[PDB]
């Protein structure tokens, strides 16, 4: 009778060992991870890269007759027949100027390049930048690097490219960061006389705070800043460490692109777009990097734009961009105050030779800074390693039947002898 | 002497095994969890449901003499004695309209319904919606579905109700989302001539971005949008998975509500309120769902409001809403640009046959989109499961005394003799 | 041949046990932790303390001739030679007043000057409501910061009970209508260090256990808008060494009852200024002597700036293990509505323009009646290590602690 109770106890114990062991094994092959959040104080923080664009792509006073000829349809200033659209709400002077530039009688077309057009007709930072301050000391427009995006000629402060060393901040708070007073030059905006898809009613700038290791993607990752306010941006540096397969989904390999030195998801997207447009239309857009020839406005109309839209719509499988394992993100909180005060309106108007109306509707102040001298870390950590797996299997294997790998080897010994 | 040192080693080993084993047992019985954060790229994102209200509950030009008679005191247009309050700083015409509407001389009242009054007097989406675009293609006011909230007649885009399929976005950024130009119609706002508790000075709209599975709760979960700016709202889809008892506190059961098909904490809140008001006052407010009769303004005055206030403090234990285990939340970052530009102000003024002053104080553009085509996941994960407990107990049990469950069974066997 | 493969299996098995066991040993000695996020529903939430300053340090109408004499250079209204700045863009009345106050023919405490000349909450506070019930200016406690005379609602200091809210949403919180008094702003005729073009207020939402640090931790609120602030209470629990970096011993400073990272920062600053200049600035607390405007120019400011740059290691403030933080999301609506501008203008005896350029409404509340908890939790405890080493020790060679002791005996005998 005792051998029966022993047989039942050994059988049930071996069954429990079976299901528990297969449980821990399956849990290991899920490759599970859990997250470790930490806050690290630092004596210094590397200030990020700040890219800003004017919402107006190009200045009206800088557009020329040749520009209307080649890119008149693309710039939406002229209709398909090289004639001005509906004149509703058209200033007499502006409409006469445009009508004069669109005469096109005995006109010899000069050579035209999209990057030349954006570079000269775009808003000059030397005119927009009314004042610059970093850590309380003056900055020059030479700190701003020209970057071409979908919005046109844009500028990146502290880009850290072309061998310039990146700036640091040793104190947090509103004073100890970037602080620029900009004039968005609303007088230079393209007149809107007729409704169009490209017609926009916004006035202000668009800013993206990003690491120097990634290029700007201002059309998607930027936030707007409106004239007439001083906007504060409190930043919190975040350092992210992800896990590669089979734990998570990250880009383990450096994967350097021909266009960009360091791999970033932004660089992967704009690289994918660049390759697609170069293959499909044999030309490259203004914002894209490389050595390819830039598109002509005819190529823009008949190939480039429908090609990108078709790439977005047809299938995401062509452009699948994984996230790198080491990522520096910047968190940001926005707040506003009014500019200028009644005590300063006259002084600003006289300082920049403008009317107080103009100052009120054209001046914005951007204040970008770190809230405090610390950074957060978010790390994906492996939850079950092979040492822990063997430890649990050994513990339960020793608890239920008290056997070992040598014991199973001995049972296989008798099986081979049998 | 050797058996004595052996006895000391076995005793100390058995004590240590005792305290370590009870340690792992207690840690298991705390039922602990830890969190798994992950970010997932996606080729498509389901666009959320967007509900907005005008801050002005009902239009002044649509209020009628009968409305003043029944709900004049409730709307704060008339005083306790059904008379207009002080006319201080009242436009002559503006007051003339109200004085004529509140005559009540030889007036034979007609039936009155609160939901009819809000549905007819509230701001019409056909007049507010100056332009609508979703993913660059035009939308109609018919895309917005009417929901009645505490703020009055409100509208939900991509509500996904009545069999409509939920919309998706295949690109991120400002262009590729919902983008509406609204006229908040500040001329239709209730005149404020005298101080009252209900008096408010704000002008604009209130928006809540929420999953289609939940009803809006704009009085608590909404954010404001001011006229004269294009407000960008960058959304981040977050997918949350919680643990039921005994690990955490989540809804293990489906939790069928009578009013709503899907369970949500909001649906639980307005369910608690609706049930409480039906039991105490036998009527429901406009925002509440169901089939009960709507309250009359007298019922509102003498029963509903004090009942809700008594519900907040006295019965704070009475309404307990557990959180569901699988929840889709949307995070948001707001930024603004100025509207309109000087190059467009007059074109807007002529396009909508308004003065530039009006455009300046009445037009707002709302741009709701996903920052990028990805979603975050926040999961509560069990930290100590029974397999790990048995493995650790077996490991320490085998390290300290080298025993097994069969060893203790044999010890009970020898003890049996 | 069988004993040879048995011996090799025991050798290799002991090697595997060695590397796995040392693996768990080293992993345990990393002292790792992982994060536990949780959301806790509550019937009540303790409302935070809200400190706000006007961006304008002191009122122009309250400055007197003596104040111009002593602190004229510091306040930037007068130059080093006690003369008026450039007369470009100067109000005729303001310039006549300043020249009159600067007559300096036949003609001071910093805290008296800030306390009396600063913006009075009794004039700024046009309306106050908390949970729908009226509040008085006496509920705000005066705190002196770098911005000047500032005010803290629900400060909870001096034994006052902390306020609670039993409902979430815009109505059920603090709601104040303020007049920033833009007419009292210092006239700016020439460039100066204090010169600012902003108009509005600065707010910091913080727990009562920590002092305000509004020049660094504050956000702006612009006039002409009602800004809503949705708050989410967060409770953070950190680990002390060797797991993390937290202050296990509170080691509260004499200046403040409860230890906070901010309180440690301003304590270090006060101590440094007392050591180098034998005086304390306006914002600093204690019983120490306040600086004179001459002391400010030649000692205080360069000492503070040099303290930030020269020795950043000197002030090391550890983070406490239990920290209550408040998350916040801002949004705006326009104030006043066209239907309400006239009533406000007449109610407060101001022009409709003045209301447009001076009135702001602040609405601070909890989004919902819950709070988040973020806890650092130990990933490998000594019981788990002994369990893993025991499991692998029993799987690979099947030995025990008693087995190793017996091996020491048999080795000792032979
Ligand atoms: C990602 O960041 C980690 C640190 O956060 C890097 O790990 C360091 O790698 C260097 C080798 O170049 C070592 O000298 C350091 O000791 C490592 N630090 C730690 C904490 O392990 C890692 O190399 C980075 N990965 C990439 C691809 O850049
Ligand atoms: C200010 O600008 C106007 C615009 O052309 C110009 O005529 C005037 O001379 C300028 N004044 C000064 C002082 O430069
Ligand atoms: C435009 O509005 C005015 C009143 O403001 C009205 O008289 C006129 O008929 C309107 N025109 C159109 C085309 O609606
Ligand atoms: C810290 O806060 C937690 C709740 O978040 C509480 O349980 C604990 O008692 C507090 N004190 C310590 C020393 O952890
Ligand atoms: C109202 O404002 C005027 C203009 O400054 C002032 O003279 C008058 O005294 C004010 N009324 C009161 C009651 O303060
Ligand atoms: Ba009752
Ligand atoms: Cl997992
Ligand atoms: Cl727990
Ligand atoms: Cl670790």
Author numbering:
A (entry chain B): 42 to 459
B (entry chain A): 42 to 458
C (entry chain C): 42 to 148, 153 to 459
From the paper:
In an effort to unambiguously assign binding sites for divalent cations on the resting channel structure, Δ25 crystals grown at high pH were soaked in Ba2+, whose effect on ASIC1a channels mimics that of Ca2+. Crystals of resting Δ25 channels belong to the P212121 space group and were obtained at high pH and in the presence of Ba2+. Inspection of anomalous difference electron density maps subjected to real space threefold averaging revealed nine Ba2+ sites within the acidic pocket and the central vestibule, in general agreement with electron density maps from the Δ25-Ca2+ x-ray structure. However, given the resolution limitations we are unable to define the protein atoms directly coordinating the Ba2+ ions and we therefore simply describe the protein residues that surround the ion sites. The acidic pocket, an electrostatically negative cavern which harbors binding sites for toxins and putative proton sites, and undergoes a large conformational change during channel activation, contains two anomalous difference peaks for Ba2+ on the resting channel at high pH. Despite this limitation, the position of the 9 σ anomalous difference peak deep within the acidic pocket suggests possible coordination of Ba2+ by acidic residues Glu 98 and Glu 239 of the channel’s finger domain. The weaker, 6 σ Ba2+ peak is situated at a subunit-subunit interface within the acidic pocket near highly conserved residues Glu 243 of the finger domain and both Glu 220 and Asp 408 from the palm domain of a neighboring subunit. The central vestibule, buried within the channel core and situated along the threefold axis of resting ASIC1a channels, harbors a trio of threefold symmetric 8 σ anomalous difference peaks for Ba2+. These Ba2+ ions are situated at the nexus of upper and lower palm domains ~ 5 Å from Glu 412, Glu 417, Glu 374 and Gln 277 residues and immediately off of β11-β12 linkers.
